[PDB]
Scaffold this active site. Structure first.
Site, mmCIF file in Angstrom:
data_model
loop_
_atom_site.group_PDB
_atom_site.id
_atom_site.type_symbol
_atom_site.label_atom_id
_atom_site.label_comp_id
_atom_site.label_asym_id
_atom_site.label_seq_id
_atom_site.Cartn_x
_atom_site.Cartn_y
_atom_site.Cartn_z
ATOM 1 C CE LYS A 70 -39.135 85.100 6.256
ATOM 2 N NZ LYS A 70 -40.547 85.454 6.647
ATOM 3 C CE1 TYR A 90 -33.965 76.750 18.674
ATOM 4 C CE2 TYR A 90 -33.504 74.809 17.380
ATOM 5 C CZ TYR A 90 -33.935 75.394 18.542
ATOM 6 O OH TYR A 90 -34.418 74.650 19.604
#
Ligand code: NA
Ligand code: NA
Lengths: 415, 415
Positions: free
Chosen positions: A273, A331
């Site tokens: 996102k 991430y």
């Protein structure tokens, strides 16, 4: 056209061709002595005559202390390059720059990386380039760099290109068999049901390890098939659960003699996102699996003695961790964190005889731009990642810690 | 489409918009105090109301010590991103990771780079991201990072994106005028007849410096025109000649009060050839101009006291130095060497009150792939390079040394 890269199969000699070692530093001679039985060594000669193509060329630059001395890179390499075999290995060995002694020596030892990274972009036919630094405090024998040289000077290192390996000062003992370097070792691999994790299990078992393949309950069927095939065991669990450490400890106690020699923190998720669109669950889930869990498994298993003397921890970083990636603030944070875990824990774990390193894959086939924008003009294979991990896992790699190494075919992308 | 990037002109306020500073570390408060007069500060509020768009957003992450704490990056930034102005500046300030104290703190401080590099690839409308580390031993005032923050939080930093700035522990004094930060300083710029060197002369003079423009005899006419325009002096010489140091010393003694405050080792040549096709003259010429000369000018001018207390040395590295480039084993070696010179000399020069840093330009307009493969989707301008150099040159940048910073629009290419 992309080269079909040479890769490793059991029993293979290390090189398809000879190994020429030169340069007038502190490594050339002891390296000849160490590698003579297993490699076909040749020497430089002014006639420029060699019966075979070179499978490897190693230049010892540890003696270069002044910028004028860098000319030996030219004088040494330029006459040798036309005799390289396909998938040949070119290596420069220097002294850890900060340890080089004089200002001028540190400058030239640091400068070597510009040379090697450039030469990687010139080599033909799948050949690769590597830079290895050795601590100034290594003994004359230089046994601590042997596992690094044997990894580089083999088919195993096929997709590692342009990179820098940093060896400290410790002495090393060879494994009983360099062809089964993980014999007797118990290796826990997370995320092992499929993909790169399953290939890591396969390579580890090939090398003689007993693999504990870990993945989530939901992947139990695939995990069982991997564990059966590799001669290991399957352990289903959620690496984020409070009892993950306990469950691993109980499992190795029941099946594997109570020890974990090698921990590969490979499990990872993405919840992509843009940060502008981020939410709490997508942030937290990624931090929990990818950063908190590897930190906890490593600290918990060291903390109860399951990982002890001889231990090897390898975390999976990634390109996003090094270069960043759009939509991956969560991430990328975790993957940079995996580098941080290696950098922070290396000195602490040294006292217990444990190393910790990180591997950052590039573009691995598991799109056309990611695939071709590297020196080898192709994507990598899962086995290529597994080989680099197995190198750090080697019992003979005790002098290699706190390293992050990419397995990327010398990808353009970076920092 | 590429954004038309905001750049600096004399007298401009630092930002087009407000400056929001938040986070609960050791930097937020003293930074508010330092920047209040010159910036329009605003605070976070739960209503999410601000009269103006943000020209800058700074998050102080120095207090984050555990991976759970990284969630504040999300909680802080996600509600702010929609209020960024075009060419806004987003900055995260952390603690030098190795100095963060605990293992867990070092992990999260290191992890910040994955976050910032990723956010750089998400920001819109020419906005940029930066990571600044501050030594744990900096005083509460944090005056040592002020020049770094003022450079980032301005139009000057237009093409610096995705990068990491490392500030040590020293205290700093502002220049007499932040808008003429180099007032009274004597700056030697090599390769100044044309191109980036001529723009460095222009920017330095804009900032109040007296420029000694150096280039080869053959560029005398162009060099004279630059020196005249900027109100400086022209010194023709070959930087490789044994008497280069003497000639510079004599020149500044005759015209500039006997001192060199700022040395910019910008002169460079290429002699591109694949290593397989290299010859002695193409190797030696490049090493002589690009590595031996900057080493000699720096060590010689420090050595006779021409560069002394307050000195600032900036070397030009390059992408080839960091990432390597085909056909440039010679050039890349020298450009990695320029990083080495900053890394090696930083601690030695510290004792004399001199800093040394390196700048690595990306793709600068002086082709379409080099131009668009960066977060800003455009090539840079010579002025953008000059601005980063002028930042290191600042008298208030005494706590910044041994850094290599790219000016690349966050180019994909790297290591
Ligand atoms: Na032999
Ligand atoms: Na104000």
């Amino acid at each position: 056209q992309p080269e079909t890269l040479r890769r490793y199969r059991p029993g293979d000699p290390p090189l398809a061709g000879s190994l020429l070692i030169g340069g007038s530093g502190r490594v050339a001679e002891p390296l000849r002595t160490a590698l003579a039985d297993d490699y076909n060594l040749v020497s430089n000669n002014i006639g420029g005559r060699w019966a075979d193509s070179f499978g490897g060329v190693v230049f010892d630059a540890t003696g270069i202390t002044e910028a004028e001395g860098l000319k030996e890179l030219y004088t040494f390499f330029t006459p040798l390059l036309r005799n390289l075999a396909p998938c040949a290995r070119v290596v420069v060995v220097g002294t850890t720059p900060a340890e080089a002694g004089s200002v001028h020596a540190q400058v030239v030892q640091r400068a070597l990386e510009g040379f090697t990274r450039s030469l990687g972009k010139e080599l033909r036919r799948g050949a690769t380039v590597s830079l290895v630094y050795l601590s100034a405090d290594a003994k004359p024998g230089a046994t601590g760099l042997e596992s690094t040289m044997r990894f580089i000077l083999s088919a195993k290192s096929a997709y590692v290109d342009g990179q820098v390996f940093r060896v400290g000062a410790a002495d090393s003992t060879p494994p009983a068999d360099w062809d089964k370097p993980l014999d007797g070792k118990v290796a826990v691999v997370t995320g092992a049901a499929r993909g790169i994790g399953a290939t890591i299990a396969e390579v580890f078992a090939r090398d003689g390890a007993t693999v504990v393949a870990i993945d989530v309950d939901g992947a139990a069927e695939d995990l069982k098939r991997v564990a059966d095939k590799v001669g290991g065991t399957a352990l289903t669990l959620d690496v984020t659960a409070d009892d993950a450490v306990d469950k691993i400890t109980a499992h190795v106690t029941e099946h594997h003699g109570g020890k974990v020699d090698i921990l590969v923190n490979n499990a990872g998720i993405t919840r992509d996102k843009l940060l502008a669109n981020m939410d709490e669950k997508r942030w937290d889930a990624v931090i929990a699996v990818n950063l908190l869990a590897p930190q906890r498994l490593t600290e918990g298993l060291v903390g109860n003695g399951t990982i002890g003397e001889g231990g090897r921890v390898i975390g999976l970083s990634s390109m996003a961790g090094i270069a960043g990636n759009r939509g991956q603030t969560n991430y990328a944070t975790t993957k940079a964190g995996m580098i941080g875990l290696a950098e922070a824990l290396a000195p602490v774990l040294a006292d217990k005889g444990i190393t910790i390193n990180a591997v950052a894959p590039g573009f691995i086939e598991t799109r056309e731009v990611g695939r071709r924008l590297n020196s080898l003009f192709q994507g990598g294979q899962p086995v290529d990642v597994a080989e680099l991990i197995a190198y750090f896992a080697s019992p003979a790699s005790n002098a290699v810690t706190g390293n992050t190494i990419r397995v990327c075919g010398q990808a353009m992308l970076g920092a």
